From a paper:
Mammalian excitatory amino acid transporters (EAATs) are responsible for clearing the neurotransmitter glutamate from the synaptic cleft. The best structurally characterized members of the glutamate transporter family are the archeal homologs GltPh and GltTk, which share 32–36% sequence identity with eukaryotic EAATs. In contrast to EAATs, GltPh and GltTk are highly selective for aspartate over glutamate, and couple uptake only to co-transport of three sodium ions. Despite these differences, the amino acid residues in the substrate-binding sites of mammalian and prokaryotic glutamate transporters are highly conserved.
We determined a crystal structure of GltTk in complex with D-aspartate at 2.8 Å resolution. The obtained structure is highly similar to the previously described GltTk and GltPh structures with the transport domains in the outward-oriented occluded state. Comparison of the GltTk structures in complex with L- and D-aspartate revealed a highly similar binding mode of the substrates with analogous orientation of amino and carboxyl groups. Despite the impossibility to superimpose two enantiomers, D- and L-aspartate are capable of forming almost identical hydrogen bonding networks with conserved amino acid residues of the substrate-binding site. There are only small changes in the positions of the Cα atoms and Cβ carboxyl groups due to the constitutional differences. However, this divergence leads to only minor changes in the interaction network, consistent with the comparable Kd and ΔH values determined by ITC. Three peaks of electron density located at the same positions as three sodium ions in the GltTk complex with L-aspartate most probably correspond to sodium ions, consistent with a 3:1 Na+: D-aspartate coupling stoichiometry. At high sodium concentration (500 mM), the Kd values of GltTk for D- and L-aspartate binding level off to 374 ± 30 nM and 62 ± 3 nM, respectively. When plotting the observed Kd values for L- and D-aspartate against the sodium concentration (on logarithmic scales), the slopes of both curves in the lower limit of the sodium concentration are close to −3, indicating that binding of both compounds is coupled to the binding of three sodium ions. From these data, we conclude that D-aspartate is most likely symported with three sodium ions.
Numbering used by the authors:
A (entry chain A): 12 to 122, 127 to 431
B (entry chain C): 3 to 122, 129 to 430
C (entry chain B): 17 to 122, 131 to 430
Write the structure that this text describes.
């Protein structure tokens, strides 16, 4: 059965299974007897994340010039900010069509300390990479791996045979590791149809029943807005750089479906990278840098979930956001999506920062704190679709930057 | 550059047996004569150094040997080796509880404690998922062996795949990586050998401290617990291990003389995981087993195959249940076999975890450790002599790991018969 | 240029702390010093592990063993001299005699065993240098043994492994040099922040402590280091000129362990020591060889007892020499840890830090200027590591005599 089209079978069936079990009251059998298999699928991808990030980027940063890496960053970051900003802008319009939370009708009454930005930045530079590796801190690994692979290529270009042979040997240890990791990613993706089925079956069972109210109308709204981001911003950007966007989606889909049901960008980095190499044809000089960075700081789906649910609260308490306030949201939902860790649920946690920025404080027991908790009740329903666009923008950004740097192997894009 | 240097000249297997016998005589003297606090202060640190040294080697020598060994074998074999070692571990655990129950009733442990007592899916799955690590750098830093065993097996297998490629580039990268582990494994096994120079001293100290602290306590019905447990541990070795060993054509007397360094070390460190470096170096040099086997069976067995604990748990549960005037019926002892096997599989390879898990074995037959009850009193009588019993069991926990590794090896033709001829 | 940022930042921070903009300096200049510290920090664990595995293979145990026996004997004697200087310099300045406070008239072994790691992957993640030092020696010693095997097969495995450490060390030393491009800025920021916050406080008998502590630190360099250096035939003006990057990085980061990458690259590029030496003596000395701490402790211990009217007797000052040496060995190589350990030196002559007591006030006067004293302290903590590594290296002929000629 076509493995491009079989992981898609597990997604649908688990969704029907979980919706059916959820609508019929067996979600506790699904948590006990089905949830563990998706958890196994999650643990397997998780173990690959730290080595496959470290090794691919040491290799990739050696296997390219600094000035390219530097131009890749400036390019990928210019793309990343603007695709995030467009996501906020799309959620705001999609939130109004669906008219989210206007019928929740809570009275509220007429109404900062922004987190230090510098310490988050200094936090990029690790102070012990063995610790950042053991703690799982991807962004500090990205920094050390680039710094390291850059130094390895410098040492490969030295007059000594003794120095060249030591540095070149080190780089082979990383190349040996990276090639081994991409191998297992492909092997675990044999189980991927099952883990997908279990995760979506557990999720649909627990919060299926909850997608029935104006929360259901929220879900309708968030998924619609995510879609526009793809078919408008990604397809147009993809088609703009001469990439058949249908060939792009057809290649991304393994990374999209694991992103969806694991609700973790960082947890689906291995599939996103293996998709970026085998299917997409990107060179490690590119995706070994952009794909892990984007798993953290490029969350188009979160920046749009945050845009849609922020309108839901202000409507739900009778203090709708003015225009001048929605323009603060574009700034601050981008900032919060940059800050959102790539693990399940962290986007809701960061949504608070976005409210605190427009003057909707979450004082406990207040009407605002009530609307926030209506959202967190369907968070997994919205979490799946959110992480998917967080990854898809990482691939569309990697593929687009690659065709710009001549680092895209066009032999992989031929319907024959 | 010191003043004095004279040690290190004797058969280390014979001198490690010298430190064990002498330390037991020494600690017993401080016990009945009251210098047990000098031994904890002035002798225990040497046994502690010997433990830290073996401890530093565990994570590299498991990771490297199993990456090496797992690349150096075919998966369809590895899967059959696992199936073989796993069925052996279960049957021998079941056999140990079966022996502890029989040896426990023969010695009749705790039948005369005379405490009055009033006549009055969910949990295992996460333990399995937890075998799969979610970050191996962390599982390494945290010391999580079973997650590393998993990663190491999974890794080396991928390395052999890459060594078989049309590319000269992929083959040589994998081939290079594989050398780093092989380089690491050989360096670890080297240091194991250097450290085992200190082992006659470290063995002497550990047994001297334990015998000093808990010697005095082995005088009462706890002494009869000791009598039962050692008798069963002895029976488990000379009956089930010897009969099992001889059935597959291994001289059981040759096994013990090769195992002894691991046996004596497991005994005095009371930690399977802590005697793994000696257990593997013994599996290679003395036993003649190939890294394709013991790099998997020896770390897997240090955790999940505890024959010595599974017999300890059978004897002490009979001791407690007899001690409250509600002796165990047969139908319960068949639950003890079911549940002490389960609880011995769960017992971590650290000193004392068998008592901590012994509680789970009691909870399974209806002896709750509610505070102030008679039951909690008998459990604490056991925890009072746990070290005296901890030594003898970890010896049989490890002795059974070597016996299982060698027996599985000869069925896969992977044992070097040149060490067994003379 | 690292020496210009040090001068300019100190003049700058003194001015800002004098217009009350020390919180403007903490807000807008301290981060550059923190980047420079995080950058140097990331390198310590790899560049220590790799350099010592390499260096320990590339030398004989009996040398390493004799180097150790030599470096440890050097380490003790130079430390003991510092306290004797702090006692003399603290007594010369008569520190804290005008504080006039009335006072009432009437596990070590585990730290040793702690050197032996129990999981080296963990000791790596934790930043525990000394347990890595032990494992790296134990490892690298094993590699040459396997490279000195009859096998072609094992010779190539270990030779492969050793190259991984050599490849890593060479990248580490490379990055240290690149990070030192930023160092003129990071130095400026750190000294500007410290001068801003604690400048104002060098004004009282605290000023005389700063005067006293720095004066003795200088003698340790210009007397004991220079005399010992000249005794083994090393030009001290060429030495300091080579040491300076490690000195000034140690000065403004107040972390010996944080200056390890600069101290080692100075030991290789500038000094010319072989990894068989400095990859063992320099990380060992960052922890246990603190001349600068032992002199602070001698001067400030005199400061407390004078400030409370129970001056130390001779028999007591001779306990300070023993115990300020011991406390400097125990002081971690991070900012401030010498002050924390000064407490153990006070308790050693009977100045207990019972809360609210007169003793506890003099301690807190000292902790108010700790950073002003911490900078000068960590500088002589590494400066003594370089001087001894070079001196011990020349005794094992492992010093490159070509870098000391023009
Ligand atoms: C006890 C026996 C009960 C039998 C079933 C009765 C339960 C109520 C209807 C069930 O159908 C679901 O419930 C919501 C009904 O409101 C829909 O919400 C929503 O569904 C979309 C989003 O999923 C939104 O766009 C829609 O506006 C909104 O109707 C939802 O989709 C639909 O699947
Ligand atoms: N699901 C997480 C966080 C979120 O849901 O916002 C991610 O993008 O990786
Ligand atoms: N001694 C422990 C378990 C126990 O205490 O029984 C071991 O085998 O590692
Ligand atoms: N500054 C620290 C400790 C101290 O202040 O003494 C060091 O030298 O490493
Ligand atoms: Na974006
Ligand atoms: Na992303
Ligand atoms: Na983010
Ligand atoms: Na068993
Ligand atoms: Na065992
Ligand atoms: Na166990
Ligand atoms: Na010294
Ligand atoms: Na020092
Ligand atoms: Na110290």
């Amino acid at each position: 059965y076509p493995v491009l089209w079989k992981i898609l079978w597990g997604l649908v069936l688990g969704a029907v299974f979980g919706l059916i079990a959820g609508h019929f009251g067996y979600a506790g059998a699904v948590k006990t007897y089905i949830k563990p298999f998706g958890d196994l699928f999650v643990r397997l991808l998780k173990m690959l994340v730290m080595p496959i990030v470290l090794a691919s980027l040491v290799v990739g940063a050696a296997s390219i010039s600094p000035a390219r890496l530097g131009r890749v960053g400036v390019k990928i970051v210019v793309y990343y900010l603007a695709t995030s900003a467009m996501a906020v802008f799309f959620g705001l319009i999609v939130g109004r069509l669906f008219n989210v939370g206007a019928n929740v009708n809570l009275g509220s009454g007429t109404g900062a300390q922004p987190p230090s930005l510098v310490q988050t930045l200094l936090n990029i530079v690790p102070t012990n990479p063995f610790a950042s590796l053991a703690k799982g801190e991807v962004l500090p690994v990205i920094f050390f791996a680039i710094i390291l692979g850059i130094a390895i290529t410098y040492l490969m270009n030295r007059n000594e045979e003794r120095v060249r042979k030591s540095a070149e040997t080190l780089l082979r240890v990383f190349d040996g590791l990276a090639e081994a990791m991409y191998l297992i990613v492909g092997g675990v993706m044999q189980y991927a149809p099952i883990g997908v089925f279990a995760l979506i079956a557990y999720v649909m069972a627990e919060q299926g029943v909850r997608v029935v109210g104006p929360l259901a109308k929220v879900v309708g709204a968030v998924y619609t807005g995510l879609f526009l981001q793809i078919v408008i911003t990604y397809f147009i950007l993809l088609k703009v750089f001469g990439i058949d966007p249908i060939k792009f989606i057809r290649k991304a889909k393994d990374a999209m479906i694991t992103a969806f049901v694991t609700r973790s960008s960082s947890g689906t980095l291995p599939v996103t990278m293996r998709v970026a190499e085998e299917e997409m044809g990107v060179d490690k000089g590119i995706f070994s840098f952009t794909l892990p960075l984007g798993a953290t700081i490029n969350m188009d789906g979160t920046a749009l979930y945050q845009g849609v649910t922020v309108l839901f609260v202000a409507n739900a308490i009778g203090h709708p956001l003015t225009l001048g306030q929605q323009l603060v949201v574009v700034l601050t939902a981008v900032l919060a999506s940059i800050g959102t860790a790539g693990v399940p649920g962290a986007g809701a946690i960061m949504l608070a920062m976005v409210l605190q920025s427009v003057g909707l404080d979450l004082t406990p027991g207040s009407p605002v704190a009530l609307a926030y908790a209506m959202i967190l009740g369907i968070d997994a329903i919205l979490d799946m679709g959110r992480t998917m666009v967080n990854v898809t923008g990482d691939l569309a950004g990697t593929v687009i930057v690659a065709k710009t740097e001549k680092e895209l192997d066009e032999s992989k894009w031929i319907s024959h």
